[PDB]
Design a protein around this nucleic acid. Structure first.
Ligand SMILES: [Mg+2]
Ligand SMILES: [Mg+2]
Ligand SMILES: [Mg+2]
Ligand SMILES: [Mg+2]
Ligand SMILES: [Mg+2]
Ligand SMILES: [Mg+2]
Ligand SMILES: [Mg+2]
Ligand SMILES: [Mg+2]
Ligand SMILES: [Mg+2]
Ligand SMILES: [Mg+2]
Ligand SMILES: [Mg+2]
Ligand SMILES: [Mg+2]
Ligand SMILES: [Mg+2]
Ligand SMILES: [Mg+2]
Ligand SMILES: [Mg+2]
Ligand SMILES: [Mg+2]
Ligand SMILES: [Mg+2]
Ligand SMILES: [Mg+2]
Ligand SMILES: [Mg+2]
Ligand SMILES: [Mg+2]
Ligand SMILES: [Mg+2]
Ligand SMILES: [Mg+2]
Ligand SMILES: [Zn+2]
Lengths: 65, 177
RNA sequence: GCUGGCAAGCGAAUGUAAAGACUGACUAAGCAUGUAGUACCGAGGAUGUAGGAAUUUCGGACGCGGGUUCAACUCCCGCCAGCUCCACCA
RNA sequence: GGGGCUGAUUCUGGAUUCGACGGGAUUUGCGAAACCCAAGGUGCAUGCCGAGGGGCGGUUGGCCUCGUAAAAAGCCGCAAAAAAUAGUCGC
RNA sequence: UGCCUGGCGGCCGUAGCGCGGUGGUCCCACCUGACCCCAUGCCGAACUCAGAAGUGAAACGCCGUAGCGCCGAUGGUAGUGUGGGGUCUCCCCAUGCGAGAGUAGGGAACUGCCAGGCAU
RNA sequence: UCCUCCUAAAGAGUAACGGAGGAGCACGAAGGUUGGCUAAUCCUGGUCGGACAUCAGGAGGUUAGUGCAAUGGCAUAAGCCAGCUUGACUGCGAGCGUGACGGCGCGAGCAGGUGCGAAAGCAGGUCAUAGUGAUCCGGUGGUUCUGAAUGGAAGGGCCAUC
RNA sequence: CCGACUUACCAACCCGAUGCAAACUGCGAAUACCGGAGAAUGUUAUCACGGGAGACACACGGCGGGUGCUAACGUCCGUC
């Protein structure tokens, strides 16, 4: 690395809304205190259901046949 | 290089028995990580180049190299030597440090993240993939930015073949389809 | 369900047919073909590039072989089409 | 049959016709032809000789059929034989 | 004295590509990390300065492969300097010099210095 | 007027109102040294980005490039960047090539003082060939000179230059 | 009608052959020319300087050519 031409690059804490607070190195400065992350994103860890044939909610079949 | 030191032995053990290797050096490795802020429509105002060179510096702490044209394509009316974009390349420690940030903190600021393409290999499996915004990175917020530009990330690896690179990335837990 | 059959009735106290073997010609028909999957399309499994949205050049400075070009009708040759000069002395 | 000037609104090498009309690529829904399938329903068909088709004739002969072959009807031609067309303008 | 390795040359297209798989006791490469003293017009991609945990995986080198690139006879042909001729936009003879391409074939380099590591 | 190719017959030279193109410049860097580097074209992947840019890998090896027209060359690179600088110096110059001549060009090396490189060494412009005009007459600055009786001056000569 | 299909037609690279080029050469002669050595021959035929000229209108044939019509007792170049 060259001299002081690049910005400061030190470890900065990052806490999500789940059980993972990381201490990766970043130049952001102030602590992240971020939101939903890879370990808790709905991509592979929740709500895999999609709109794939849900259908109209039927309420007519509540009076007679 | 936390992910490096943690997963190096594990991926070596996996890939050796997967591909019938006979040496430690034969396992596919990671060469570098490259990223170019391809700012083309910036001929009229040079301030876009400075904005790109600041946003890329914020994304990865370094000084982006202001690239120059070498062909002067008339389809956009450009002359060689004029600044067009800025590229940043990271090796080793910085490569690993940026890799964990692009792996872990990349989802919250992006939308419709249903995975990444599994056919982004340039024959030899170098995994060039693009993102459509910069605020995806935690370093850059939306209040301080005026324009919206993406990135052309490329994780250049030592893998001999595309399937070896894909196995490399899957062992590194990258979100494929 | 008429019912062989008894227990807890009768009026103040009584409805009422069902899909599980398919072992086999593996219905017929023009011999065949599926014994519950084939003939049939559908979510019973699904995952893909026609067209609807916003940005650009393309026309039109020409009649045209090119060429210097990153490139032009605007730069230098030749193909025509207009203006103009000469085509004379023996 | 031969020379010179024009083929330039620019001569000075970089016009978005501002617009409608071709063509490109980017961001959206879907229809086995923008998809790759027999599994729910559990019926009587794939194909095997197919009959000539709206008023008339006809398409890879199967888009329409069934019993052992006949009316054929989902399209195309005759057909819609409103295409007769700015403003001003005589008895 | 024989094995292979390193450095410098001669010879620079039979001396170069493709395929097969070997080499680590030595030497080379890969590599570790890097405040220095040096370096990137960004990053130890290259220079390097501190070394041997591992590997011959890429290289480098070695052995065979006739798939190539090439070297290429004899004979023949084209051409011609002289003299002498015809039917003279071209050709014949006596003479020497005799190509290019294509056949037969050759071929998977030799060789000189030290510098070590090997058996002797 | 000058230069490049062929006619030009394998040394030099060689004509036509022959066939084809350019030159009457630019550069205090586009020169010198040192260090470093190697394209044109095509294929694959990738956010706008497209037959086209900026990226990552591969095929290929000069089919790119030379400030310019053409020829001959350029890998040690003459092709491209970075640091320092003015040798784009002064007086000479053995030898040679080319011209009838005026002339033109190459040139080892010497003396003085510089630039780069640790050093060996390189630099007397630009990869080379076009980018140019004799003499006379006058202008400008210096002069180890000449100064028509003397001492200066005028003027002339000498050097640089218009 | 999708067109079954080739309709005396045209059709990028890539390979396999067939030709042409003064301004194409991965190759390549004879002759021409320079230099080094040697015998034989030629009235120094060789070079330098000085005095004196003449001359710068050539043509044909042979050979390799431009131009022309590979036409001219036509024209332009090189050798005898
Ligand atoms: Mg190996
Ligand atoms: Mg012979
Ligand atoms: Mg021969
Ligand atoms: Mg031969
Ligand atoms: Mg000659
Ligand atoms: Mg150099
Ligand atoms: Mg010095
Ligand atoms: Mg030059
Ligand atoms: Mg005069
Ligand atoms: Mg006096
Ligand atoms: Mg004076
Ligand atoms: Mg000759
Ligand atoms: Mg005399
Ligand atoms: Mg005389
Ligand atoms: Mg004369
Ligand atoms: Mg005369
Ligand atoms: Mg005369
Ligand atoms: Mg004559
Ligand atoms: Mg003659
Ligand atoms: Mg003749
Ligand atoms: Mg004649
Ligand atoms: Mg005459
Ligand atoms: Zn989380």
């Amino acid at each position: 690395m060259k001299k002081d031409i690049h910005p400061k690059y030190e470890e900065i804490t990052a806490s999500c809304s789940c059980g993972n607070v990381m201490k990766i190195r970043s130049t952001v400065g102030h602590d992240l205190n971020l939101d939903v992350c890879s370990k808790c994103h709905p991509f592979f860890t929740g709500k895999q259901r999609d709109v794939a044939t849900g259908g109209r909610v039927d309420r007519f079949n509540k009076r007679f046949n | 290089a936390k992910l490096h030191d943690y997963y190096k032995d594990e991926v070596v053990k996996k890939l050796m028995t997967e591909f019938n290797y006979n040496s430690v050096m034969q396992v596919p490795r990671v060469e570098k990580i490259t990223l170019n802020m391809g700012v083309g429509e910036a001929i009229a105002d040079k301030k876009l180049l400075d904005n790109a060179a600041a946003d890329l510096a914020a994304i990865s702490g370094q000084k982006p190299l202001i690239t120059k044209a070498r062909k002067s394509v008339a389809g956009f009316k450009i002359r060689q030597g004029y600044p067009i974009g800025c590229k940043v390349t990271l090796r080793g420690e910085r490569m690993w440090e940026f890799f964990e940030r692009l792996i872990t903190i990349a989802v919250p600021r992006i939308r419709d993240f249903r995975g990444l393409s599994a056919k982004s290999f340039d024959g030899r499996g170098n995994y060039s993939m693009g993102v459509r915004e910069q605020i995806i990175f935690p370093e850059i917020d939306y209040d301080k930015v005026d324009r919206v530009r993406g990135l052309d990330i490329t994780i250049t690896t030592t893998a001999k073949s595309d399937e070896e690179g894909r196995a490399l990335l899957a062992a590194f837990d990258f979100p494929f389809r």
